[PDB]
Amino acid sequence: GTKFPKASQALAQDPTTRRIWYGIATANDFETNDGITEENLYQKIFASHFGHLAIIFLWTSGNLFHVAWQGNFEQWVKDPLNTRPIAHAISDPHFGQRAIEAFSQAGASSPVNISYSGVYQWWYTQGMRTNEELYNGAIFLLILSALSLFAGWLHLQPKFRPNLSWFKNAESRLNHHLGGLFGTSSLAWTGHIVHVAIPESRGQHVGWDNFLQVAPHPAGLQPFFTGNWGVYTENPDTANHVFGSSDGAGTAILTFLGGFHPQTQSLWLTDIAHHHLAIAVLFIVAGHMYGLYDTVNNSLHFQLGLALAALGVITSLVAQHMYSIPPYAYLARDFTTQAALYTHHQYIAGFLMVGAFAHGAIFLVRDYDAEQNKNNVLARIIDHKEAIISHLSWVSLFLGFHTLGLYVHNDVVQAFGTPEKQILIEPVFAQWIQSVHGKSLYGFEVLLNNADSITRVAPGSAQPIWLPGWLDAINSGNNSLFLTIGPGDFLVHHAIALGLHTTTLILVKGALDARGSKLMPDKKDFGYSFPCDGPGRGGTCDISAWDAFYLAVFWMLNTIGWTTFYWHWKHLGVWQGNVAQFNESSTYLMGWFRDYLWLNSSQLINGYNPFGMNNLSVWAWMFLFGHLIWATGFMFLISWRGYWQELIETLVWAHERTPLANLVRWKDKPVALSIVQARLVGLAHFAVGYIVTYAAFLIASTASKF
């Protein structure tokens, strides 16, 4: 009888290696610990959020420091059109001499990593110009993380412990997070843009020492009180004005021109200044307002699923809006970072959206009470749960029968020497919406292509001022604002719609069927995560609500895989000026295979040939490294446990009978990985290998050509 794990004392009596693995897995599951009370529960959640908040602060200080120390931030401000951003310096003893000459890139003397996160682009528009300004930010975030780790320990002391009623009072929680956390901190960020980021974009150095002297406006705050707010909309930065100098700049601070900067292809900072200003006013007035509420407040897993659903929606919202509307200077010109930034947040948004349904499914086993919850919206969705799954079983099967057959049609027909016979459906619905938003390329001629429509004219109060800026961007084919789509873009969006419907189908299958079916009626008596109910009743493998999460992680990786293959290959012809490659080849699945996976992975895969090596050989290594770890998950997925338990029962024998090693004895009896355990182990190697392989391919196929 050992001590570890302290959480589960029933795991401590386990004398096998399962105790070691299940101690790592039942670790941060705080509802499962022995002797826990709900008053003690929420305080451990509260302090763990402080520990997590410091990690985000320590991570950002590391990104600020290693650009300040080992980067080229000052060299990149003077010329962002040729200089590649440096992430950190490389110091590995395993390198050769010909490799240090190949990784001493961006003109540096030491092996450095060319950055693809674009925090250079983010900090350049927040106002920073010098390497010392980034270091002061890294120093400051070490103070905030110290403030986070102190306050987490502080709010576990017996005099500073928050009460249970302080935790379950959500009425004052929403008033303060929309009010203070969302409203004032958007009003505070409005103070950063007008004081600092706007004059730093016009050649004026505004730092902590001199910002009390200089004012953001030549008529500062004297017309804010008499109501004459229109004087902040004076002469702005013209089309002549290059970013970061006084070459034809302006004095306006809150303008609503719309459109992009004519040289950096980014937003005007006066737009972002007036943006977060109005976001602050809406969130401030939204915070002065405060049997289902007894369910959402009681259930910790309910609010976590809704939070991951809210996070997962707004994370896709970032990636969809950041590439078409670039908010950062010279981020549109950095093709590799723009590609890496879309693919970053979309893969996280899939993980957040899968985890939303996952934690709602845990709520239905643990926290849901059908005798208390009756006749509300929740106990009605359970009441016709067969109607929701089967109608999700149709739209999954309706699209997948047809958009596959639409591909196999176009494959077979193109293969037979007759490309002129393909079923090419022009996406007229979305091409209407671009023509509704103003794209006059197609020629639909209603709604903001209609120059005499009431929306473009706005006959009430002569409002339409932001439409001159917007309509010079969507109509011009120099950026990614409302990309020109054709029939190849039709077929992928229905593959995408197949993926979002199928991943929802699996996730709401195990959500609604977490409490029982005709197979296992008592699935709430066995918990959220358990392997099976045996070989009886036909055999019940992967039956649980945990294993319905587990099958949908393959589907989100495939759906984001369909998504980001389409993002990358569409932009690989947009950036290269040859849009016709996605035009003809994307309609059939061989051009998706030959002209994207085969054609673009050539310069990656010559990262190390027998004649030399390049700076892509770290990506060509991590490419193959990602193939190997992905394929290893298959081993835990295909092969199952009792093969290996009868393989260890012979390795236990051969260890107990081998002299000079018979003497060395284990303390944990070696067992095979459990059933639920190697589903996770196989999915982890699958999911890491899915992501590591693309991130090596997406970077090296774009850095070789731009």
């Binding site: 009888g1 050992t2 110091s91």
Partner: peptide, 30 residues
């Protein structure tokens, strides 16, 4: 010069220390 000292410290030495306290914390008993 500070890269040449720090990266074999947390690449080799510091994992070997935290592996030691964990392996003793695992296999100890009350």
């Amino acid at each position: 010069n500070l890269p040449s000292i720090l990266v074999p410290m947390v690449g080799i030495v510091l994992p070997a220390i935290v592996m030691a306290l964990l392996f003793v914390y695992i296999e100890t008993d009350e």
